[PDB]
Amino acid sequence: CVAYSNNSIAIPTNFTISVTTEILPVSMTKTSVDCTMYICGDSTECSNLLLQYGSFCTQLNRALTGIAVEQDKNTQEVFAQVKQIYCTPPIKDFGGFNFSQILPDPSKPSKRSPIEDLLFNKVTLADAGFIKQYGDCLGDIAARDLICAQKFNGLTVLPPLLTDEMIAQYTSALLAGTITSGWTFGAGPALQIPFPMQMAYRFNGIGVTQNVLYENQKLIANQFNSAIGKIQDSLSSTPSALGKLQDVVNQNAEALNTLVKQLSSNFGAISSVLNDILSRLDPPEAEWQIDRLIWGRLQSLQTYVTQQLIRAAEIRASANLAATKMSECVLGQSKRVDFCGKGYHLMSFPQSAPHGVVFLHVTYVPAQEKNFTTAPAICHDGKAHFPREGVFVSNGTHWFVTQRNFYEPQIITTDNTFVSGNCDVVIGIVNNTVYDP
Amino acid sequence: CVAYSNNSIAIPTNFTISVTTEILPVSMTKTSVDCTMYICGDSTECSNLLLQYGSFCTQLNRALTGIAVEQDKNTQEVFAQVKQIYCTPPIKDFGGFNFSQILPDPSKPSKRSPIEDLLFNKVTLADAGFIKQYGDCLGDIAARDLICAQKFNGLTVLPPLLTDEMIAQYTSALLAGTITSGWTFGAGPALQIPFPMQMAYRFNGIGVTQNVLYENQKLIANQFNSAIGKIQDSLSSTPSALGKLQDVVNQNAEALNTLVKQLSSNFGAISSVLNDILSRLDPPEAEWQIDRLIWGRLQSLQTYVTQQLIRAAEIRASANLAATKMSECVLGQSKRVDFCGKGYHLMSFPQSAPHGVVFLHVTYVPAQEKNFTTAPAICHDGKAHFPREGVFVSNGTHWFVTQRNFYEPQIITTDNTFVSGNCDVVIGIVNNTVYDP
Amino acid sequence: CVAYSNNSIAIPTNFTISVTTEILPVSMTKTSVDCTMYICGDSTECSNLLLQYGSFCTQLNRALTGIAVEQDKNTQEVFAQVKQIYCTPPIKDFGGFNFSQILPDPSKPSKRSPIEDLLFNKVTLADAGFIKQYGDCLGDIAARDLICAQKFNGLTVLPPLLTDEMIAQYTSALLAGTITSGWTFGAGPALQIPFPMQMAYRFNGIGVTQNVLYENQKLIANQFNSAIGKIQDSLSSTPSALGKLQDVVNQNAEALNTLVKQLSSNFGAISSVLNDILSRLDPPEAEWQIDRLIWGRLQSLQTYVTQQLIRAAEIRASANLAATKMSECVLGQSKRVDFCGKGYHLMSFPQSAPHGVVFLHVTYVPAQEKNFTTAPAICHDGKAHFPREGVFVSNGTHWFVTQRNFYEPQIITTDNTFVSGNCDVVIGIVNNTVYDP
Ligand SMILES: *[C@@H]1O[C@H](CO)[C@@H](O)[C@H](O)[C@H]1NC(C)=O
Ligand SMILES: *[C@@H]1O[C@H](CO)[C@@H](O)[C@H](O)[C@H]1NC(C)=O
Ligand SMILES: *[C@@H]1O[C@H](CO)[C@@H](O)[C@H](O)[C@H]1NC(C)=O
Ligand SMILES: *[C@@H]1O[C@H](CO)[C@@H](O)[C@H](O)[C@H]1NC(C)=O
Ligand SMILES: *[C@@H]1O[C@H](CO)[C@@H](O)[C@H](O)[C@H]1NC(C)=O
Ligand SMILES: *[C@@H]1O[C@H](CO)[C@@H](O)[C@H](O)[C@H]1NC(C)=O
Ligand SMILES: *[C@@H]1O[C@H](CO)[C@@H](O)[C@H](O)[C@H]1NC(C)=O
Ligand SMILES: *[C@@H]1O[C@H](CO)[C@@H](O)[C@H](O)[C@H]1NC(C)=O
Ligand SMILES: *[C@@H]1O[C@H](CO)[C@@H](O)[C@H](O)[C@H]1NC(C)=O
């Protein structure tokens, strides 16, 4: 097992690039319900009475409308952060990085990346759900909105303001900018920079010198390409990968099913049918039975609305988090641990998903650690010398200085150290020569 | 359109300082409702019966009380982060920066900044709203609280614990500290520092050397002053700028209006008036009709309470975000992209607003980009040299090194580069002389 | 009072390490309620009727189940971030830091730290609460779940998936890793490093050179040890320190008490007892009275469920914040102001608490500030020199350069300054000699 030591340090001699996907729901289907059609359907005697209950219907209808509008804002706040659409890079001559699975391709009319085309297939809408049956009733015609609503007990699904194609186009712009302009494309003009240099400068942000990339550019490129390939298989095989997006769809479907099914409930009355009770009873007695169904059908709808408001808040938080991660992880480089995947964040790539966003985080994780003896300071000519950058390490009989995240032994010289103190205060100082550079 | 290139880099030759306002709601009006006065008003027969319904009234009353207390905490958590009130700086001899529109002035008794005096005028309370009518009924007297509540169907608005003047005083302290003590005033004692130096050190935090400020101090000062002037006009002209704060006020007003209006509803009864039904009917029949209004007037109030709880959660999240932004953007310098406005964050200034906070974010955005040929490394004497800071750029026949966010060509010397490798591994290395400093 | 000055700077000559605790609720008791036992208990006539009300019971039961599952996820997302359990460090020979109050000890079978053993005692469950009475009814037996539920009006508390011991074991692993492997244990392999070096490198992250730790290691160690001792007394004495955790427990207890007490309510009927009304009335009249209690007992339970959903969202946000702070504050070093305690964040230590987490944040706050005259640049041989790091300060007749967060006057030399401009542009430049290093 791991054991502490007062004079031993472990420094990584190698590295492995990894890509970790994170899926967050961003929006919900713009479902809506009419309160004067769910309770009373075609009946004129049930409406007159429902007016005496005041604003109850108007309150629930307005609440659902707010949720629908919130879904449009949620999507805009995430994907619309950049609207200076960057043109796709036609030069397929990067330094080995094969974005072919990340960027779109022309071999299909959907203009979606191979990963996006898989995500859009893993999430599906069942034929038993009213969300699909309502669409078949319209047939893209808008005039039959009220006709289909009357058939589906007043259920109405509004069309999203931004189509799936618009979201894909916005995501492509973010990708092209990051690949061609780095993190600065989101903080100003399209300051183009070569991608190998961009990675070299991102390495310096995680304490790794630019040298490591250039001397390992082919190896680093191969690692990135393999990681992007493996994630596609992982999502394809694992059926419960996009559960976060499927769960929100399933939850909304169950809510509508329970709401519509409750119309078949008597709530303590002679029947669930308003024409049957109104024909069996006389007027001075039917209104007692037609008041029990109205009150049961109002609490049912109120339960649906209140549950949707709670669910909408969860999606709103996820959408805000997604927008924050797009800015920090995609448009920049987040130093915050675990915010842009495991390991040190280098860069991330966004991918569109149905009612959600998938972030591909590229991170640097050290590997192949090796033990080395270390000392806090070096003593020379009575002066105590400290490392300006990196750590002092001992290769048996010799002492060297090296980067903390990559083993690179260098001779201890005045150019990489600084001096302070009379060598009598630093506990554990070791005597070693410092050469003049 | 923008095009990628493997050997071209764009570096900005100039900069434009910009100020972007962000408005967040922090609190809500401390509205409260009594459940034994909304349903039954002055009637003793309606109360006896309302007791049989158990704790329903106590649950709703306690819920509203919690919301009111939460509003006080929300404001305290945002503005009370610093309470060592810093004295206003009477020396109007900064390095050109004209905070006169940001700081208070003595020409008015409100002691609010010119921007604050505009924000407090763009948000207004209508005379038709009960929030104002309740205040006119009290006339600052506290003894008539119960008398005015009985008139307004039990509606009662509690006074905020912190007055608008207290919030302004707290904001002034934060401003004076930031202007006179920088980001350290919030992490320890009032370590005073000259403002030009403070900006010079904030520039170094965004990759821009201190030199750029000193050689452009007058230009930078003029840019800041113009930006602070333009924002005042923007808020004055644009009527939908403070909508986030007006929307929460409007939403609460509509909720009370719908609640009070529902008292005029029969909920399926002989009349909405309890004395009328109780006088027309005998006792063994009036209780059937006085049970239908109690149940309608309880779900109405329950709908108001539940909707307020959902709205209070949204304000709580905004208040927490505002407190986080005050610490990160005002008391410090946030590296997180888009968290403290567009562009690289330099500093921000807080301004008080009715039930909200307005953050003025000052950011650095590069401008006037110019294309330059770049190489990843320099080859000299067979050794490959890499840039210690900045990027190598070619001015036609000559190669230079320059900062990434400001064009400053310097001769390539050992003092600004480091060496590694035998010049046979770096792809794209170029041969150029490195001079001895 | 503090006063601004254009040529004076304050630099701290000393420092005081401080430890500030932050308590956040992470989970809630897995309470659950059966909807066909709260309303109708043992009665077969009340169930037949309750079926006509449709899915109402199934909706409320499913909602409570989701909350219970959410509590398990909340705890896992916070504590399970690391599962490579690090072995306790048996070498009690650190550089003076006495973690004995932070780490567990073997003198007790609970295997909890002295601070953890106090936190687990300050929060208690009253004997009048059903949460305890339900446990006494089971006696650790699982077969009597349904029997005890029938006695407690259908109330059922589920056992947590992770026991208190498992949470303590996970917290110990995080502590051992941080003490023996620093922030890298959470971003890769267990890269061991000596603790004094780890603190020396964390100091460099707050602008303080490693020198300050080594020359003050004994003083810094003593300060840390004293701070850890004082916090234990603070929590022991202050009774309202863990209120955030006690409040959530109290709120849930009151909710169940109000729910169960409402069974004693007539809701406008002949009695709250179903056998009494069903025996006094004939069948064609008892169903009118047995429909009024069902509807009152359904809105009561619905009010409990909706309030719990609102409360569960608050805990979910706190749990997410706790997980974020564990990653940023414990597994790393957060530059974000006020996110990991007052002052500059050095490191933090986690401690388990009942249904919550306590973070011990160790921060650096400067002290003993001293005024010094400063200049933005130095003029020599007509060239304007700027400080590469730190600030220029004047000790009366002599000019020196020093770190911004620690007074360390050094001679101005080319090794600690850089040159730019012709000395005619920098406003406030002072003439002083720069020596050749
Ligand atoms: C580092 O790891 C990679 C894994 O792809 C391996 O190919 C390589 O040989 C290892 N060593 C070095 C020095 O790169
Ligand atoms: C990128 O990967 C795909 C995988 O199918 C491959 O077809 C393509 O040739 C690769 N690109 C290059 C330049 O080899
Ligand atoms: C490093 O240690 C090995 C093992 O003792 C030795 O063979 C080698 O020469 C050492 N390195 C140098 C530069 O002497
Ligand atoms: C940079 O932009 C400012 C805009 O105010 C302009 O005055 C100035 O001439 C431009 N060029 C330089 C070198 O500052
Ligand atoms: C600051 O701006 C205001 C704008 O009205 C102006 O009156 C004032 O003179 C300015 N300050 C200075 C020092 O010029
Ligand atoms: C930079 O390029 C221009 C255009 O060729 C040239 O006139 C100028 O002399 C170059 N700079 C230097 C320092 O030679
Ligand atoms: C700094 O503060 C500590 C407080 O513990 C004190 O012991 C010490 O004498 C002070 N001065 C120095 C130079 O450390
Ligand atoms: C650590 O503190 C405890 C406090 O009771 C003390 O008993 C123990 O001796 C201390 N450790 C050392 C090494 O002195
Ligand atoms: C610093 O100032 C004091 C007071 O004038 C003086 O005694 C001392 O000699 C100065 N330091 C140096 C290095 O001259």
XYZ file of C-alpha atoms and ligand atoms in Angstrom, chain B residues 13-16 215-216 219-220 222-223 367-368 406, ligand 4:
27
model
C -1.963 45.433 -31.660
C -4.482 47.452 -29.615
C -7.189 47.080 -26.980
C -10.570 48.545 -26.044
C 2.609 53.758 -21.687
C -1.172 53.955 -22.272
C -5.697 56.316 -23.109
C -6.833 53.554 -20.746
C -10.175 57.866 -21.095
C -11.600 54.542 -22.285
C -8.605 44.650 -30.887
C -6.911 45.432 -34.208
C -0.193 42.628 -27.110
C -5.833 52.183 -30.147
O -7.223 52.478 -29.972
C -7.493 53.783 -29.439
C -8.993 53.890 -29.293
O -9.353 54.860 -28.318
C -6.904 54.862 -30.347
O -7.086 56.135 -29.740
C -5.423 54.606 -30.586
O -4.913 55.537 -31.532
C -5.215 53.191 -31.107
N -3.802 52.921 -31.316
C -2.895 52.940 -30.334
C -1.484 52.635 -30.737
O -3.198 53.192 -29.172
